Ligand binder design. Structure first.
Ligand SMILES: Cn1nc2c(=O)n(CC3(O)CCN(Cc4ccc(-c5ncon5)cc4Cl)CC3)cnc2c1-c1ccc(CN)cc1
Ligand SMILES: Cn1nc2c(=O)n(CC3(O)CCN(Cc4ccc(-c5ncon5)cc4Cl)CC3)cnc2c1-c1ccc(CN)cc1
Lengths: 343, 343
């Protein structure tokens, strides 16, 4: 642990992106502190997902040996390779963050999950020839960006908010106005302090009747200005984002190699987390080397998920955690477990 | 205006002597402020509950741009008259306040925050010279009263504090079975807390007037204070190096004099003067050297209490506080309060 100050997670079976996600959440310090505050007193140790996350986080913060997850995987039910093949990374994030948000209801940290992670967008449909429009505001906790045909994150976001035509056979059913020509789009109302972006790195290919991986080059910046994708900017807080984590997949399949790059303090000092092995790495190894190979090389290593933190919130999100942020009760609970196990 | 410094004052409401000085001192003990916010003040009465009254003063100190009142707070613990404050020393009011919140933090996630911040351990011994008898008393302490008359500075006070006293001749020690014996009395520090409260003995009983008088002698205190040599056993993993945080000052010879506090709230050596409702930036010299007290050649303005913070604990003790550290429940309760009188 002393190489970097950070401890790894055991490779325990094939859980694909799990270890990567767990480190990403662990180093969302404000989330971690909120999780320690959950009132898991009466919870049963084997079935409680909130306690199990407390346990993983406690061990990540204090253990100098790699940390196990078997109680965690048992607690939310994904104990086989199939569970991870049949879910996307953001679905596992939703499973975990939903559990702890519900456990935080009625406590001092209620609402921590929404405040850190959920933004607001509006999706619209506008009829060209008649006076009819439909608006639906929608909350989101992650964004799935299209990469195929796009060179970088900015072009992905341009694509995401682009106006789409519904004419010809596409025509919009406008109800009492009949079939109409219209343009459909989405706009961002807000962006959250912690921004979870998944890249669409598998696409359904009819040729094989199965999904294949997209290995194309796709660039993302260390610093991400997003003000121009809001509907209305705030001069008092520009939507400037800072890269926190790069979740990486090497290979073409669920048998590939999953790792995560983080700079946990947000200072641009990066480490690579490869299950039990954590090592310091260059910024290039974390960012540019995970852009993905371009056509010429004749490279299946590339990012599928990025975490950005709003500039204006970085010091709050990444605020230091001391072991006095872990309640004595929980400390004793987990330390009792260690004594039972070691004998 | 609060924008001068970012800090707001407390109203001068009658003669509460050192109270406003001590409230700012505690408010800028950030780790303690956050714990106080975490207290479960659901069902207590606003005019009866001291823990709720402290939350409310702290909440207003953190959010209001007008000076903050204290009548609800003084009413909740009973000191409504100048006599109430005249009869107690500063550390007694501190003890009253910290006792209330610590009791209220039992069973909660922040249980024990008060001892962790403020309590040290000392051992007091009497050792018989000529017979085999020794009496040892371990004791907790939350504050230290330092003698200043005849001492030039804090180091000489601490030298005095731990100096061995001879019990012989007419002040021989009653050693019980061993009769009257000659012995040596002393004190040793086992631990020093992260937040160190030092009262200077600036009032001494004088036989000439048969009453207490203020001692206005020069007594120097440093910005950095190494204390390792006063520990019975030192720790090479954490030296007892302390950083000056606050200087509580008195002007006059009288409880009718002027009470102010100087703080550098962030511990970065940028000082402000807190003069009830008026907070202003000041130089380091006005906070420290100007409060040493007039050297005889010539001043009744001087420090009576200093707060030091252990070097190794500064970033934890002074960890920044956002409004996310205040539970939404409590915010609503205090905002309902404010609307009722606003109308
Ligand atoms: C289109 N799209 N692509 C996505 C994607 O990649 N991710 C990352 C992973 O969830 C999935 C891929 N792994 C790596 C990986 C494993 C095995 C193979 C493989 N096995 C056989 O062949 N190939 C290939 C790969 Cl890249 C990392 C985690 C997440 N969401 C994606 C979406 C999507 C878009 C909209 C919605 C509705 N809002 C829901 C989902
Ligand atoms: C000896 N000793 N001195 C102390 C002291 O100064 N403080 C600071 C104050 O509590 C007291 C002084 N005021 C300012 C002040 C007000 C009025 C007059 C005045 N008016 C007319 O005459 N004099 C003069 C002044 Cl300086 C500020 C707060 C606290 N504890 C002190 C002790 C002490 C030592 C051991 C124990 C047992 N552990 C208990 C107490």
């Amino acid at each position: 642990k002393k190489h970097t100050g950070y401890v790894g997670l055991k490779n325990q079976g094939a859980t694909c992106y799990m270890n990567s996600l767990l480190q990403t959440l662990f180093f969302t310090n404000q989330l971690r502190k909120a999780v320690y505050m959950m009132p898991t007193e009466g919870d049963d140790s084997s079935k409680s997902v909130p306690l199990a996350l407390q346990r993983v986080f406690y061990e990540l913060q204090h253990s100098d040996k790699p940390v196990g997850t078997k109680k965690l995987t048992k607690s939310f039910g994904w104990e086989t390779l199939d569970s991870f093949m049949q879910h996307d990374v953001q679905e596992l994030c939703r499973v975990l963050l939903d559990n702890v948000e519900n456990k935080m209801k009625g406590t001092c940290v209620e609402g921590t999950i929404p405040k850190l992670f959920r933004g607001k967008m509006v999706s619209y449909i506008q009829c060209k020839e008649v006076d009819y429009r439909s608006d639906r505001r929608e909350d989101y906790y992650d964004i799935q960006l299209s990469i195929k045909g796009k060179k970088n994150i900015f072009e992905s976001f341009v694509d995401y908010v682009a106006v789409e035509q519904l004419d010809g056979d596409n025509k919009y059913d406008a109800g009492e106005h009949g079939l109409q020509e219209a343009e459909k789009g989405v706009k961002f109302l807000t962006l959250p302090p912690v921004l979870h972006l998944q890249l669409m790195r598998f696409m359904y290919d009819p040729q094989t009747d199965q999904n294949i991986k997209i290995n194309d080059r796709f660039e993302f910046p260390e610093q991400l200005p997003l003000d121009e994708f809001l509907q209305k900017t705030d001069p008092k807080d520009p939507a400037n984002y800072i890269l926190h984590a790069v979740l990486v997949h090497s290979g073409d399949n669920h048998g590939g190699h999953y790792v995560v790059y983080l700079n946990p303090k947000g200072d641009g000092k990066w480490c690579k987390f490869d299950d039990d092995v954590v090592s310091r790495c260059t910024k290039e190894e974390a960012i540019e080397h995970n852009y993905g190979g371009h056509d010429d090389d004749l490279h299946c290593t590339n990012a599928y998920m990025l975490v950005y933190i709003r500039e204006s919130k970085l010091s709050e999100v990444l605020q230091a955690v001391t072991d006095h942020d872990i309640p004595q009760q929980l400390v004793e609970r987990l330390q009792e477990e260690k004594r039972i196990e070691a004998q």
